[PDB]
Design a binder for this molecule. Structure first.
Ligand SMILES: O=C1c2c(O)ccc(O)c2C(=O)c2c(NCCNCCO)ccc(NCCNCCO)c21
Ligand SMILES: [Zn+2]
Length: 331
């Protein structure tokens, strides 16, 4: 075709999930814009021991420039997949993709060792800000800017009443599934206090001993692009998760009381059809130039209506924060 971004991807074999993942990333406007304006050359990290000397970021840039040139109805991501395979010899490809891009473009030249401190008695605000600052001392890139948020973990040990509060970064949110359910039900279930199994207990440093310490997670800060992975694999759970296309307001789940509005509009959806033993991934994506929705099935690109987006096939959701929309301003 002749419109940039309406470009499919040939199936190199099975390459599970990679094409739909690339389409989700391709239709993440700030990421694609960063690559198309050649802002990535300045930031290529050539001797990061955790990176590919820039080869992942370079191959992704070439692929994205091809997809948004308007010259192709579909291309092959063969060089990109080759580099990704060298970075990750082998599931959730997305974490490895985001990590490969991040390290290839990390502004930190040499990561310093940071001694972990527990929250002690300090306020959540102080400890969260400390953790975010420490993270940026080790990880600072366009991938952090777009995708990273901060979550809280509270572990309470019944043996010695010890409470361990830690704040940790994330680049996507894996949600448990609660029969039809709403997305907010999955978020709510994500933040509920749980009892760790005997198969997965906590090593209490005060006790030098593992056992059933309660664990509860909380969202501290949410990124410009919130990636929400619905945990359908542990047989495959096909529950219809009803999620909004527009105006997802996350503020009720944020425990940072000085946080911003965090309202989101959906931009992409990774679908899976079948089960693990037999399955295929596709994607819905909103095109950044005309605002319409499209369906990407490898090389095939076609028009879509919002009627088709919310289905039980929905597997990963890409949301963009309304205050980060390019060329748009809220009051
Ligand atoms: O491609 C779909 C599919 C679709 O494009 C649109 C709607 C759908 O419902 C499907 C779909 O269900 C599907 C598969 N479903 C499970 C049947 N086999 C499972 C038992 O082994 C199992 C496999 C499957 N993919 C076959 C096409 N892929 C060829 C390249 O790998 C699909
Ligand atoms: Zn203990």
């Amino acid at each position: 075709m002749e419109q940039p971004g309406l470009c499919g991807l040939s199936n190199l074999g099975n390459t599970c999930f990679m094409n739909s993942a690339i389409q989700c990333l391709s239709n993440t406007p700030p990421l694609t814009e960063y690559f198309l304006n050649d802002k990535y050359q300045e930031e290529l990290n050539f001797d990061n021991p955790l990176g590919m000397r820039g080869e992942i970021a370079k191959s992704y840039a070439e692929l994205i420039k091809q997809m948004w040139s308007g010259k192709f109805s579909y291309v092959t991501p063969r060089a990109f997949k080759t580099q990704v395979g060298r970075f990750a010899p082998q599931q959730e490809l997305l974490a490895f993709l985001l990590d490969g891009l991040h390290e290839d473009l990390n502004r930190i030249r040499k990561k310093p060792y940071i001694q972990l401190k527990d929250a002690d008695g300090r306020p959540d605000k102080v400890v969260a800000e400390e953790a975010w600052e420490n993270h940026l001392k080790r990880n600072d890139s366009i991938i952090v800017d777009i995708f990273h948020g901060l979550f809280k973990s509270t572990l309470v040990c019944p043996e010695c009443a010890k409470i361990s509060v830690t704040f940790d970064p994330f680049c996507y949110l894996t949600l448990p599934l609660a029969s039809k359910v709403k997305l907010k039900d999955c978020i709510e279930l994500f933040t509920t206090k749980e009892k760790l199994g005997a198969e997965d207990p906590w090593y209490c440093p005060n006790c030098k001993e593992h056992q059933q310490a309660t664990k509860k997670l909380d969202l501290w800060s949410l990124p410009p692009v919130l990636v929400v992975h619905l945990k359908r694999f542990s047989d495959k759970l096909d529950t219809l998760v009803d999620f909004p296309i527009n105006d997802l307001d996350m503020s009720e789940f944020l425990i940072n009381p000085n946080a911003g509005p965090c309202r989101y509009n959906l931009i992409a959806v990774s679908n899976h059809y079948g089960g693990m033993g037999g399955g295929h991934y596709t994607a819905f994506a909103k095109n950044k130039d005309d605002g319409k929705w499209y369906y990407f099935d490898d090389s095939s690109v076609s028009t879509a209506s919002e009627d088709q987006i919310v289905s039980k096939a929905a597997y990963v959701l890409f949301y963009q924060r309304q205050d980060t929309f390019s060329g748009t301003g809220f009051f």
